[PDB]
């Protein structure tokens, strides 16, 4: 009982501005995994993941989308740079590491995921180990069967007196790291992860375009295309040797991403083109786009900053003109120097807030207001001095 | 309950001359970490470190500030050379090593920090063990419950006669490295450093500018930019596999440092610029700066030398003019030859004292006074002769 | 309570001829390690090893000095060729192997050092195991408490009768390799070595100059300088993964050595220059220098030869003119062919002594005298025939 595409897109909208097509795309991928489980044994083998290739400029949403998608599916996720492997012509590394690295992270998850879904029970039983070294009326019976039976009486007021109140606390934590372990099953835990990898794995391959042709030279194209060749089995369906078991890449979902300014998806090796059935483009972000990014996402950077500052007992407020001013800056720098997409926001927002971020603890209890005035005072000069821009922003 | 920016800048002033803006900048970063903890669960996630990029010439304080900042916060700190990774196009090393190396040092920390926060107590309990062998004195019960209760009497006198006075001493040490261990919990100790790395970790990346661009050549720029690329995850927030566990870089603070004479911060890749929100310049030092550096820092090299000579029972005194003449020397060599910033004070100062440093053990009891004359007597020649300078200073 | 520099130089004088500066240099390094231990916790961290760079021609003392220094400090020592790593651009090896290789040797030491400091006690207790299978009046008591008590009587004359006299001897050795082991503590033994490496480690890096620039070509300079980059952490302070633990290079002493005929220490990477604060030159050796080397060192080659021959009951004597003649030869060959420094002595001395070395056992009881006559007869021809020189000398 998974979410529908529109449902998936929605959730994605909660974190990413624009890039609707990419969302619908990455959304159909997810839905199809549900769709597949709903078929007969025969078909379940024939239907493979509809791998996607995102086409677009830097920092405009590609990775975030893939990352949020995985999160939403609670699927193990892993990002990987394609060119990493062209290096293998010296030493580099082998592609199988992708599924291996994926599994390791797929484990770190199943672990933290299961251990956390336990740290509460272990603490309660923990006190039942401490509330046992303070009143031990164990065994069967002791007094009455009804009224006198319940031994809680003094014990109850005893545990409460301890909870809110060697060393109990020092003792419990020790019991916590003794009961929790004494409750985990590392056998199925090892296979738990594998099943994940195999049924919900999401591999993100960045720089796919950097692995393409170009009348460049024999040597380089040979190194590049090789990474493509080495990728085939992963994407066509094979078995990988995992430090924790054997994994079948057969249903892992692959989301490749490329600029394709220099090279075209048609330069990709034929076998690969076949296994990247979905093509989607992402647009460059607009200043307007920026303004929304700064605030709309539900854990937007601006929201984070406000929160971080609250920590210090300082109330921050972003004026609309302030936000607009921040956005323009990022755009201005990106156009005057090098366009790095939304990333520019973080640098700008961060330089802008330095003075406060430092003085924060001292303005404890104040009401600071970052309005268009403030912004301009702090960023205009820098934004203008190009050379200074390439260093500070 | 952290210190305010002004307070942080102040502590910093106790060690670094000038470079105020860089202080304020690094100061706000610290304060913000406090500010973050002061927020709601939601915001605590969205608010990321306000990483800094220092722009300035050699030896004028960049690293020192980073190092003193980390000390002040008691934060694990690590310094790394960006170019190190460009070598990966041959073999090099991987950037994840930064977080791993960080953790190792963050462990060496928590350890030595702990072994110390215990060595005292472990020494007392050690006594009760030895004191126990000489006499189990007292016990449960044994004599009177008041006047005849306390066993100390003999034991006490025995104790003193021991502290001031197999092999008791030999044995105790073995007991010290037996009781201290039996008091340390290696599990919480391992997770100790990890929390640190994740909550306070500070990574200083020198030479970030040697990883930019210039139409120099295709091959070199690719490798260069490769290190930036490989740096994104660490800076954008990721998970690294450590010999002692897994770490979330997500809150490690990053201070990138670059001269940027050839290349500009705008040449940096977009996703990194956006993760270096704070940009700050550090100024070249002046002879005045040198004089102050020579004596003001509360553990200045001049104060340091004084102490070492005292160790030999020799009282060294620097004259104001002597100090000025020394600073001048260092400046002149930096300009006449190759400018290496304040580092030159160390070489010059050290050459100035060779003779005394050697004869010190014999001058025991004397009052040596380094004055303008002495300085000129020992340095001028060297300074004057450039070639000699390049080898000797 | 370590030796003073003059004390260190002296000891060094017992093995190395000339090269006074290099001695004083390597001597200040050692003394400073003592000096450092004598400071407050704060400073003990800030004060790092004053690494040295020896500049000079082949076989003129560089390594011997470093080797003898380490010996005198009882410090673990290791020699390493810089160019070894430029090979990494094919496969080569990684720099970390240096600290690893260092530790392994640091272990082999702590071992042999501790096992030997035991082979005497184990042999004595060993006989107490044999002198127990010949007279077993064990347990508590047996006869009298005073006079009759001492059971040694027959036992004493029994062990002596065996010491000077299955199979006792065959049995003891078996007991030796049973008691010794049953006395070693491999836990602290593993950490024992690490502490050594960390506090007294001495790394010798030869061919530093071969790792420098030269308008040579991009490729090669990239491979070279990379080895320099890869060296930084070792020398700047980092953590290395040891087959026997974790080591901090932080206080290892580094002594780099270079000819610098082709390249200058200023071509070295900036970071490195900084960490090689001490520069020192060594001179080429003179014929006079040679003559002293042949005899003065207290375990001089000449002394070794005399000893080796004594073994065979032959008394050898070196006339002064003989020594002079030997020295000139070595010099003559080195100038006429290729100058390999003092090494030439060994080849010459060895060719010169062949006939005797062979007939030795037959001249048992004779008084051979290697005088200028002998030398000339044996070496003059060879020395003259250049081509024959490049093969035989």
Coordinates of C-alpha atoms in Angstrom, one line a residue, chain C residues 11-275:
Chain C
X11 CA 79.9 9.4 21.3
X12 CA 79.3 10.0 17.6
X13 CA 83.0 10.8 17.2
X14 CA 83.6 7.3 18.3
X15 CA 82.2 6.0 15.0
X16 CA 82.3 8.8 12.5
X17 CA 85.3 10.8 11.2
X18 CA 84.8 14.5 10.7
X19 CA 81.4 15.9 9.7
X20 CA 81.3 17.9 13.0
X21 CA 78.5 20.2 11.9
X22 CA 76.2 17.3 11.0
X23 CA 76.9 15.8 14.4
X24 CA 76.1 19.0 16.3
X25 CA 73.0 19.1 14.2
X26 CA 71.7 15.6 14.8
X27 CA 72.8 16.2 18.4
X28 CA 70.6 19.2 19.0
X29 CA 67.7 17.1 17.7
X30 CA 68.2 14.5 20.4
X31 CA 68.8 16.9 23.2
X32 CA 65.6 18.7 22.3
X33 CA 63.6 15.5 22.9
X34 CA 64.8 15.6 26.4
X35 CA 64.2 19.3 26.6
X36 CA 60.6 18.8 25.6
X37 CA 59.8 16.1 28.2
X38 CA 60.9 18.7 30.7
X39 CA 58.0 21.1 30.0
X40 CA 54.4 21.7 30.9
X41 CA 51.6 19.8 29.3
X42 CA 50.6 22.8 27.1
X43 CA 54.0 23.3 25.6
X44 CA 54.7 19.5 25.2
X45 CA 52.1 19.5 22.5
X46 CA 53.3 22.6 20.7
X47 CA 57.0 21.7 20.5
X48 CA 57.6 19.4 17.5
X49 CA 60.8 17.7 16.3
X50 CA 63.3 19.9 14.7
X51 CA 63.7 17.9 11.5
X52 CA 67.0 18.0 9.7
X53 CA 68.1 17.9 6.1
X54 CA 71.6 16.7 5.4
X55 CA 73.2 18.1 2.2
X56 CA 76.2 16.3 0.8
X57 CA 77.9 13.7 -1.5
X58 CA 77.7 9.9 -1.4
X59 CA 79.2 7.8 1.4
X60 CA 80.6 10.7 3.4
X61 CA 78.8 10.1 6.7
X62 CA 75.1 11.0 6.3
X63 CA 73.4 7.6 7.1
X64 CA 76.1 6.5 9.5
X65 CA 75.4 9.5 11.6
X66 CA 71.6 9.0 11.6
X67 CA 72.2 5.3 12.3
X68 CA 74.6 5.9 15.2
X69 CA 72.4 8.6 16.6
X70 CA 69.4 6.3 16.8
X71 CA 71.7 3.6 18.3
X72 CA 72.8 6.0 21.0
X73 CA 69.3 7.0 21.8
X74 CA 68.3 3.3 21.6
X75 CA 65.6 4.7 19.3
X76 CA 63.9 2.6 16.7
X77 CA 65.4 3.5 13.4
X78 CA 64.5 3.1 9.7
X79 CA 66.1 4.1 6.4
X80 CA 63.9 4.7 3.4
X81 CA 64.5 5.8 -0.3
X82 CA 62.4 8.6 -1.4
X83 CA 62.1 7.6 -5.1
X84 CA 60.7 4.3 -4.0
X85 CA 57.3 6.1 -4.0
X86 CA 57.4 7.9 -7.3
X87 CA 56.9 4.4 -8.6
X88 CA 53.3 4.5 -7.2
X89 CA 52.4 6.1 -10.5
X90 CA 52.5 2.5 -11.7
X91 CA 51.9 0.5 -8.5
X92 CA 54.8 1.5 -6.3
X93 CA 53.8 1.7 -2.6
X94 CA 52.4 4.2 -0.2
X95 CA 54.3 6.4 2.2
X96 CA 52.4 5.1 5.2
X97 CA 54.5 2.0 4.9
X98 CA 57.3 4.0 6.3
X99 CA 55.7 4.3 9.7
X100 CA 54.4 0.8 9.4
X101 CA 57.8 -0.6 8.4
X102 CA 59.2 1.5 11.3
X103 CA 56.9 0.0 13.8
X104 CA 57.6 -3.6 12.6
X105 CA 61.3 -2.9 13.2
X106 CA 60.3 -1.1 16.4
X107 CA 58.7 -4.4 17.5
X108 CA 61.5 -6.8 16.4
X109 CA 63.5 -4.6 18.8
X110 CA 61.3 -4.4 21.9
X111 CA 61.1 -8.1 21.4
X112 CA 64.7 -9.2 21.0
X113 CA 65.4 -6.4 23.6
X114 CA 63.1 -8.0 26.1
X115 CA 63.6 -11.7 25.3
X116 CA 67.4 -11.3 25.7
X117 CA 66.8 -9.4 29.0
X118 CA 65.4 -12.7 30.1
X119 CA 67.4 -15.6 28.5
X120 CA 69.5 -15.6 31.7
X121 CA 66.7 -15.9 34.3
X122 CA 64.9 -18.5 32.2
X123 CA 68.1 -20.7 32.2
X124 CA 68.5 -20.4 35.9
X125 CA 64.9 -21.3 36.6
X126 CA 65.3 -23.9 33.9
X127 CA 67.9 -25.8 36.0
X128 CA 65.5 -25.3 38.9
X129 CA 63.2 -27.4 36.8
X130 CA 65.9 -30.0 36.1
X131 CA 67.3 -29.8 39.6
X132 CA 63.7 -30.7 40.5
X133 CA 63.6 -33.9 38.4
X134 CA 66.8 -35.2 40.3
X135 CA 65.8 -34.4 43.9
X136 CA 62.1 -33.4 44.6
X137 CA 61.9 -32.5 48.3
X138 CA 59.2 -29.9 47.4
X139 CA 56.2 -28.8 49.4
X140 CA 56.4 -27.1 52.8
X141 CA 59.0 -28.5 55.2
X142 CA 60.2 -32.1 55.1
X143 CA 62.8 -32.2 57.8
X144 CA 64.0 -29.5 60.2
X145 CA 63.2 -25.8 60.2
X146 CA 66.7 -24.6 60.5
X147 CA 69.7 -26.9 60.1
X148 CA 68.0 -29.8 58.4
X149 CA 65.7 -27.3 56.6
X150 CA 68.1 -26.3 53.8
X151 CA 67.7 -29.1 51.3
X152 CA 70.4 -27.7 49.0
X153 CA 73.1 -30.0 50.4
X154 CA 72.9 -32.9 47.9
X155 CA 71.0 -30.7 45.4
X156 CA 73.8 -28.1 45.3
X157 CA 76.5 -30.5 44.4
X158 CA 73.9 -32.1 42.1
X159 CA 73.2 -29.0 40.0
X160 CA 76.9 -28.0 39.8
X161 CA 77.7 -31.6 38.8
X162 CA 75.3 -31.0 36.0
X163 CA 76.0 -27.4 35.0
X164 CA 79.7 -28.1 34.3
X165 CA 79.0 -31.7 33.4
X166 CA 65.8 -36.3 27.6
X167 CA 69.5 -35.3 28.4
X168 CA 70.0 -32.5 30.9
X169 CA 71.3 -30.0 28.4
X170 CA 68.9 -31.2 25.7
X171 CA 66.2 -30.9 28.4
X172 CA 67.1 -27.4 29.6
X173 CA 67.0 -25.7 26.2
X174 CA 63.5 -27.2 25.8
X175 CA 62.7 -25.7 29.3
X176 CA 64.4 -22.4 28.2
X177 CA 61.9 -22.1 25.3
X178 CA 59.1 -22.9 27.7
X179 CA 59.9 -20.7 30.7
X180 CA 60.9 -17.6 28.6
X181 CA 57.7 -17.7 26.7
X182 CA 55.9 -18.4 30.0
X183 CA 57.3 -15.0 31.1
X184 CA 56.7 -12.6 28.3
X185 CA 53.7 -10.3 28.3
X186 CA 52.7 -9.7 24.6
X187 CA 50.1 -7.1 25.5
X188 CA 52.2 -4.3 26.8
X189 CA 54.9 -5.6 24.5
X190 CA 52.7 -4.6 21.6
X191 CA 52.2 -1.1 23.1
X192 CA 55.7 -0.9 24.3
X193 CA 56.9 -0.7 20.6
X194 CA 54.2 1.9 19.7
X195 CA 55.3 4.3 22.5
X196 CA 58.9 3.9 21.2
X197 CA 57.9 4.7 17.6
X198 CA 55.9 7.7 18.8
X199 CA 58.5 9.2 21.2
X200 CA 61.8 8.2 19.7
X201 CA 61.2 7.2 16.2
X202 CA 63.8 8.2 13.7
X203 CA 63.0 8.1 10.1
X204 CA 65.8 8.6 7.5
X205 CA 64.6 9.7 4.0
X206 CA 67.3 9.4 1.4
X207 CA 67.2 10.9 -2.1
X208 CA 65.0 13.8 -1.0
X209 CA 66.5 15.8 -3.8
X210 CA 65.4 13.2 -6.4
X211 CA 61.8 14.1 -5.5
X212 CA 62.2 17.7 -6.6
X213 CA 61.2 19.7 -9.7
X214 CA 63.3 20.4 -12.8
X215 CA 61.9 21.9 -16.0
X216 CA 62.0 18.2 -16.9
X217 CA 58.4 17.4 -17.8
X218 CA 54.9 17.7 -16.4
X219 CA 54.4 13.9 -15.8
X220 CA 57.7 13.3 -13.9
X221 CA 57.5 16.4 -11.7
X222 CA 53.9 15.4 -10.9
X223 CA 55.1 11.9 -9.7
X224 CA 58.0 13.4 -7.8
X225 CA 56.1 16.2 -6.0
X226 CA 53.4 13.8 -5.2
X227 CA 55.8 11.8 -3.0
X228 CA 56.5 15.1 -1.3
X229 CA 52.8 15.7 -0.8
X230 CA 52.3 12.2 0.5
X231 CA 55.1 12.9 3.0
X232 CA 53.5 16.0 4.5
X233 CA 51.1 14.3 6.9
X234 CA 53.9 12.2 8.3
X235 CA 56.0 15.2 8.9
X236 CA 53.2 17.7 9.8
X237 CA 51.6 15.2 12.3
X238 CA 49.1 12.5 11.5
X239 CA 47.9 9.0 12.5
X240 CA 49.0 5.8 10.8
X241 CA 47.3 2.3 10.8
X242 CA 49.8 -0.1 12.2
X243 CA 49.5 -3.9 11.9
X244 CA 50.2 -3.7 15.7
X245 CA 48.2 -0.5 16.5
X246 CA 47.7 3.2 15.8
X247 CA 50.7 5.5 15.7
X248 CA 51.0 9.3 15.8
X249 CA 53.8 10.6 13.6
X250 CA 53.6 13.8 15.7
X251 CA 57.0 13.5 17.4
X252 CA 58.9 11.1 15.1
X253 CA 62.3 12.7 14.2
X254 CA 62.9 13.1 10.4
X255 CA 66.3 13.3 8.9
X256 CA 66.1 13.9 5.2
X257 CA 69.2 13.6 3.0
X258 CA 70.1 15.1 -0.5
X259 CA 73.2 15.7 -2.8
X260 CA 71.3 18.8 -4.4
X261 CA 73.8 18.9 -7.2
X262 CA 70.9 19.1 -9.7
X263 CA 68.1 20.5 -7.4
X264 CA 68.1 22.9 -4.5
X265 CA 66.4 22.6 -1.2
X266 CA 64.3 25.6 -2.2
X267 CA 62.7 23.5 -5.0
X268 CA 61.2 21.3 -2.3
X269 CA 57.5 21.8 -1.7
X270 CA 56.9 24.8 0.6
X271 CA 55.1 22.8 3.3
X272 CA 58.2 20.5 3.5
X273 CA 60.7 23.3 3.6
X274 CA 58.8 24.4 6.6
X275 CA 59.2 21.1 8.3

